[PDB]
Amino acid sequence: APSYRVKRMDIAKNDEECVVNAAAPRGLPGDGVCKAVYKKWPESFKNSATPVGTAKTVMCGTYPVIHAVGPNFSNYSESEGDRELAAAYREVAKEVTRLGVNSVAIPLLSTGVYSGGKDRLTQSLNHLFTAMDSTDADVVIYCRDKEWEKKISEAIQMRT
Ligand SMILES: [Cl-]
């Protein structure tokens, strides 16, 4: 039966059938997760640019990289940024479905450098759940912060 799990490690080392990149705008290599995805799957950046609020899949070999561009809350208002963040996750769920994968590795979009200086764990994770609950895939959420790992794990446990 489909599950959610959380792991505190580099998503570029995931054990799932595809990966969601927390993509920088304009198809650029970015930083953090996006830069790690660029180092591991550089071929997946060929024509990967896609607008804020959308996702675009590019294959590296046969391994799918779903580039999802969340809003940068330093540029967006809270209300418009929230809408684009929800929309990016909804496009991820559509791509996961279209690909037919059994599992997907996902980071929390619009956190950290794109968070506008605010902790958005709950906001981003709730949009992740809303989108991915519509799919049949095992979801493995990747984070790096120890307290975030606890809170995500707590949230996963209470939906079981
Ligand atoms: Cl984190």
Side-chain angles (χ1 to χ4, degrees):
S3 63
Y4 288 91
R5 298 174 51 241
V6 59
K7 299 207 291 189
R8 186 183 80 96
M9 64 184 274
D10 184 355
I11 196 171
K13 298 168 183 293
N14 77 77
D15 194 39
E16 287 66 64
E17 294 183 357
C18 68
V19 70
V20 175
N21 183 20
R26 317 176 77 87
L28 295 174
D31 301 294
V33 165
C34 187
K35 175 54 65 63
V37 171
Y38 182 79
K39 291 189 82 95
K40 181 62 68 175
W41 302 284
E43 297 88 349
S44 76
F45 284 71
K46 188 171 183 185
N47 294 314
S48 64
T50 196
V52 169
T54 73
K56 182 175 190 179
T57 300
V58 183
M59 298 290 181
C60 175
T62 74
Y63 188 78
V65 179
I66 306 170
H67 298 273
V69 178
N72 185 336
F73 281 93
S74 292
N75 289 338
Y76 280 89
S77 70
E78 289 296 315
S79 66
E80 185 176 19
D82 186 69
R83 195 181 108 266
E84 299 293 3
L85 179 57
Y89 277 118
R90 274 293 329 147
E91 299 221 351
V92 166
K94 170 138 186 144
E95 286 294 285
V96 165
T97 300
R98 180 184 66 78
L99 290 167
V101 292
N102 299 304
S103 62
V104 57
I106 311 187
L108 292 182
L109 300 178
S110 296
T111 62
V113 161
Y114 301 144
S115 70
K118 182 172 181 298
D119 183 319
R120 301 190 185 264
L121 187 172
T122 295
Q123 172 178 25
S124 186
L125 179 62
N126 283 343
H127 286 316
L128 188 160
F129 286 140
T130 293
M132 300 315 296
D133 275 353
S134 65
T135 75
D136 289 343
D138 288 332
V139 175
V140 184
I141 303 172
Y142 284 77
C143 68
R144 304 303 297 269
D145 177 282
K146 168 179 158 294
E147 285 304 304
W148 279 36
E149 186 193 11
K150 292 182 181 180
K151 288 178 220 146
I152 300 163
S153 184
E154 290 168 17
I156 289 176
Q157 268 307 283
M158 51 198 324
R159 321 166 78 77
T160 70

